Amino acid sequence: GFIAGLVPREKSMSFERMLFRATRGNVFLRQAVVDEPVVDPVSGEKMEKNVFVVFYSGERAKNKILKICDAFGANRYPFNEEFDKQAQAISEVSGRL
Amino acid sequence: ASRYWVVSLPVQNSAASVWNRLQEQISKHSFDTPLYRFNIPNLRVGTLDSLLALSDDLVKSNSFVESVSHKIRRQIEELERVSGIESSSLSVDGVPVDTYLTRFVWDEAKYPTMSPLREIVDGIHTLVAKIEDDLKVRVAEYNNVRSQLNAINRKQSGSLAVRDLSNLVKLVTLLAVVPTSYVVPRSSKLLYEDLYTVTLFGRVADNFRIAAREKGFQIRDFEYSSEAQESRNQELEKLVHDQESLRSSLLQWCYTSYGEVFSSWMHFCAVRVFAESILRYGLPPSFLACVLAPSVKGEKKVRSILEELCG
Amino acid sequence: MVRFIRQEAEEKANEISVSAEEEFNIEKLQLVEAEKKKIRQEYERK
Numbered sequence: 069g070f071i072a073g074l075v076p077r078e079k080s081m082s083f084e085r086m087l088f089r090a091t092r093g094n095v096f097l098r099q100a101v102v103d104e105p106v107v108d109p110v111s112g113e114k115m116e117k118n119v120f121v122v123f124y125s126g127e128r129a130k131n132k133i134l135k136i137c138d139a140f141g142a143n144r145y146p147f148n149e150e151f152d153k154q155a156q157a158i159s160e161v162s163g164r165l
Numbered sequence: 166a167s168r169y170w171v172v173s174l175p176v177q178n179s180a181a182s183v184w185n186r187l188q189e190q191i192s193k194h195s196f197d198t199p200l201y202r203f204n205i206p207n208l209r210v211g212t213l214d215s216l217l218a219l220s221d222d223l224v225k226s227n228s229f230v231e232s233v234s235h236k237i238r239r240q241i242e243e244l245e246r247v248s249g250i251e252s253s254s255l256s257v258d259g260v261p262v263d264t265y266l267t268r269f270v271w272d273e274a275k276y277p278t279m280s281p282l283r284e285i286v287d288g289i290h291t292l293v294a295k296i297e298d299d300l301k302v303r304v305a306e307y308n309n310v311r312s313q314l315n316a317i318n319r320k321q322s323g324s325l326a327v328r329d330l331s332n333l334v335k336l337v338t339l340l341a342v343v344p345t346s347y348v349v350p351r352s353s354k355l356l357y358e359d360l361y362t363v364t365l366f367g368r369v370a371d372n373f374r375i376a377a378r379e380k381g382f383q384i385r386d387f388e389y390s391s392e393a394q395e396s397r398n399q400e401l402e403k404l405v406h407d408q409e410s411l412r413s414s415l416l417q418w419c420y421t422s423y424g425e426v427f428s429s430w431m432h433f434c435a436v437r438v439f440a441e442s443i444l445r446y447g448l449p450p451s452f453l454a455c456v457l458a459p460s461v462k463g464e465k466k467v468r469s470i471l472e473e474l475c476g
Numbered sequence: 477m478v479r480f481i482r483q484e485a486e487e488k489a490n491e492i493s494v495s496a497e498e499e500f501n502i503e504k505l506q507l508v509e510a511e512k513k514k515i516r517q518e519y520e521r522k
Contacts, residue, residue: 088476089220089441089444089445089476090220090444092216092443092444092445092477093444093445094477094478123478125213125216125217125478125481126213126214126216126217126218126220127214127217128217128218128220128221129213129216129217129220130217132220209484210480210484212481212484212485213481447477447480448477448480448481449480
């Protein structure tokens with residue numbers, strides 16, 4: 069499964085603490101640097117939140133991961149299978165913004 | 166009963182320092198811990214769906230364990246004779262509770278499906294659903310017995326407000342006037358004594374009224390006939406029989422249900438431990454954990470031993 | 477670990493394929509029993 073999303077750098081400890089057994093040691097989240105506060109999807113004020121993509125195994129575990137990502141509130145966008153498509157989408161989104 | 170006191174120890178990192186050390190010569194066992202247990206592997210390696218189902222139904226298993234514990238405690242308390250069971254008397258997995266944890270013979274195809282852990286979770290849920298029927302039957306039997314026992318023998322012992330026909334004197338009526346001359350043959354004394362009788366006769370209603378309730382002592386109410394008193398005594402015998410049934414035979418049934426619930430809780434805990442091991446080790450079924458009931462310092466020693474694999 | 481679960485899913489698909497093959501073999505046996513029945517009926521009529 070795919071657990072693409074975002075995990076805040078400030079809330080990194082909370083994300084790691086929550087659903088620890090769900091990760092099972094075979095899922096690693098590639099958190100973004102988030103040195104500059106990432107603009108919130110609903111708030112222009114932005115927050116120091118990173119983007120992390122994990123691996124999803126098990127239906128309930130994937131649902132819990134999605135719920136935790138939603139509760140995190142970090143800047144999350146769908147992750148394309150090809151990195152080129154994701155980069156093009158990022159460029160288009162930046163231009164639109 | 167006893168709460169869940171099994172540390173989630175994967176096969177690679179067992180309760181003690183070494184995986185084999187958990188079975189014998191444990192660092193926890195150095196503190197005299199009785200921790201010793203094994204898990205029967207499933208037929209095939211459970212899928213990630215099985216782990217997801219276990220994670221989702223952790224709360225359900227907690228609710229089932231709470232229901233089982235509450236039902237067993239209430240059954241022991243109410244009948245007042247179901248508490249006689251012990252660890253060996255319960256015979257979970259055909260062994261005392263300490264040996265029950267070390268015995269995984271109940272993880273066969275009999276109660277669990279013995280299929281991949283996905284089917285094992287469904288089997289455990291079915292066992293819990295069946296166990297709920299035991300609590301329902303216990304509640305029904307308790308209600309029936311309480312209705313029986315309180316129905317009869319709840320009145321008085323005669324010559325009083327209720328059930329005074331048992332002390333009846335069998336022209337005269339059930340009065341038992343507790344704190345008379347006329348043309349009627351008042352020269353008589355009824356045997357309505359458990360109370361006392363007064364000179365009265367049915368030839369004159371005035372004499373009976375004066376001797377029963379006209380003034381002074383008041384007439385005590387009684388069951389209409391002595392046959393009503395006999396029926397009350399028979400119903401009291403039947404109610405005592407029903408209460409004795411609920412307190413001895415239904416208490417033994419409750420003790421058997423408590424043993425079955427303990428076995429089911431042990432099986433569910435073993436399934437949860439297998440899921441935790443699969444999370445913290447290889448997916449195929451493999452566990453080396455142990456279950457016991459040590460003191461708080463014993464739990465601290467267990468944590469010190471198993472700090473290598475901590476949640 | 478993860479590869480084990482993926483191989484389990486692939487083997488589940490292969491087992492579905494094998495069950496379909498066995499069901500198709502049973503269905504073919506039933507169909508050729510029906511073919512023998514209709515052949516016997518037509519041959520008796522002839």
